[PDB]
Amino acid sequence: SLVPVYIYSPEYVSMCDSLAKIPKRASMVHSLIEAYALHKQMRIVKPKVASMEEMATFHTDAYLQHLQKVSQEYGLGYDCPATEGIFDYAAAIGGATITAAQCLIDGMCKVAINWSGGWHHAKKDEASGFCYLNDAVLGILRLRRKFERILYVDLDLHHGDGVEDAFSFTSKVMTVSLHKFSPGFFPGTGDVSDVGLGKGRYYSVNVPIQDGIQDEKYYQICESVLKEVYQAFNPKAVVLQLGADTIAGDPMCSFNMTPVGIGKCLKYILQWQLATLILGGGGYNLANTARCWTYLTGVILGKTLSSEIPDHEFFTAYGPDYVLEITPSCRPDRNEPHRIQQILNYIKGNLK
Numbered sequence: 001s002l003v004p005v006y007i008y009s010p011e012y013v014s015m016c017d018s019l020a021k022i023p024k025r026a027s028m029v030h031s032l033i034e035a036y037a038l039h040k041q042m043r044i045v046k047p048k049v050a051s052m053e054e055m056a057t058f059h060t061d062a063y064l065q066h067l068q069k070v071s072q073e074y075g076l077g078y079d080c081p082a083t084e085g086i087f088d089y090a091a092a093i094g095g096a097t098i099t100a101a102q103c104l105i106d107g108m109c110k111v112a113i114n115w116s117g118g119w120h121h122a123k124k125d126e127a128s129g130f131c132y133l134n135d136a137v138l139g140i141l142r143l144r145r146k147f148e149r150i151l152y153v154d155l156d157l158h159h160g161d162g163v164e165d166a167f168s169f170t171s172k173v174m175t176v177s178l179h180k181f182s183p184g185f186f187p188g189t190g191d192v193s194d195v196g197l198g199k200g201r202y203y204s205v206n207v208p209i210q211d212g213i214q215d216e217k218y219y220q221i222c223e224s225v226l227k228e229v230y231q232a233f234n235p236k237a238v239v240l241q242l243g244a245d246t247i248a249g250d251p252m253c254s255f256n257m258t259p260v261g262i263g264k265c266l267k268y269i270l271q272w273q274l275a276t277l278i279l280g281g282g283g284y285n286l287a288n289t290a291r292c293w294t295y296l297t298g299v300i301l302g303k304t305l306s307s308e309i310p311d312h313e314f315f316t317a318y319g320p321d322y323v324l325e326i327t328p329s330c331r332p333d334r335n336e337p338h339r340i341q342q343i344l345n346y347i348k349g350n351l352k
């Protein structure tokens with residue numbers, strides 16, 4: 001077994017480290033997890049590289065081939081620069097989430113972790129927001145070999161548009177996303193009015209949130225909507241993305257969460273006791289993202305972690321404080337009690 005599965009292999013971590021816009025985060029994340037000796041308490045499973053056929057269960061051959069070519073418009077460039085070996089990078093992530101999926105389809109595993117996955121923005125034929133391959137989607141598509149109702153819960157700061165669009169017309173998968181929704185804020189979509197299309201209408205729930213949201217309030221919103229969604233929908237399996245770009249101190253500077261808030265949310269989903277695929281995502285303050293995910297790793301394990309940071313390779317990276325906890329800034333919570341209730345009521349009606 002009941003020990004969660006931890007997708008890892010030095011080759012995978014190093015391949016993940018080569019991501020241009022987020023260098024070394026994989027190692028840092030794994031290193032801190034290892035430092036608290038959190039691993040060796042999970043079932044370590046090596047990642048399998050995704051094949052062309054597998055990745056194409058969503059992406060088009062046109063896009064896959066092209067990507068494989070430059071690794072030697074499709075959304076490539078500035079935000080998504082096709083650096084050397086990027087195709088390999090993508091295939092390893094995708095492969096990694098698909099193997100976490102298989103780990104769940106089979107037994108002896110109620111939770112499968114791939115902190116390096118979670119790129120929800122990738123379209124079937126286009127890279128977007130640092131996302132080259134949509135692993136979350138590939139995991140969901142794998143999970144559906146055995147589960148008729150999958151619940152996708154996206155807690156990244158950004159809207160999970162890629163995964164949502166992928167299933168907007170089906171009621172097999174239900175995508176729920178809590179994100180910042182403001183005029184010029186990427187990807188600029190996902191208002192509460194967004195509920196899906198055709199046969200998928202009401203199977204896409206979006207929770208537009210504003211800057212400054214803190215642990216408490218965030219959790220009340222989350223539990224409120226999740227509880228409602230667990231009722232109407234009878235999820236057999238669950239895919240959860242935990243982008244840490246919501247954590248106080250992120251360069252993104254929008255939400256004001258700490259891993260503990262996001263923690264209560266995790267605990268809430270873990271208590272349904274369903275097959276759960278854990279993914280990472282955003283998180284541009286490399287040190288905090290590591291603190292966030294190793295802590296959440298502890299929450300998956302239940303074992304409370306030592307407040308002081310354990311000596312390891314990146315010990316220095318832990319600011320001046322050197323503690324596991326993260327303190328929110330003194331920024332205001334631009335979320336009025338009335339609009340949040342209004343949003344909740346809208347979706348609450350929608351759910352049928």
Ligand SMILES: CN(c1ccc(C(=O)NO)cc1)S(=O)(=O)c1ccc(-c2ccccn2)s1
Nearest residue numbers: 079129130156157158186243245281282283
């Ligand atoms: C590419 N972009 C994304 C998209 C998605 C994410 C994300 O975390 N999604 O969950 C992050 C950045 S973006 O256009 O909004 C950017 C944000 C910050 C960017 C940046 C890039 C270089 C230097 C400084 N800032 S680009």
Ligand SMILES: [K+]
Nearest residue numbers: 154156178179
């Ligand atoms: K989100």
Ligand SMILES: [K+]
Nearest residue numbers: 167173200203
């Ligand atoms: K859907």
Ligand SMILES: [Zn+2]
Nearest residue numbers: 157158245282
């Ligand atoms: Zn994000």
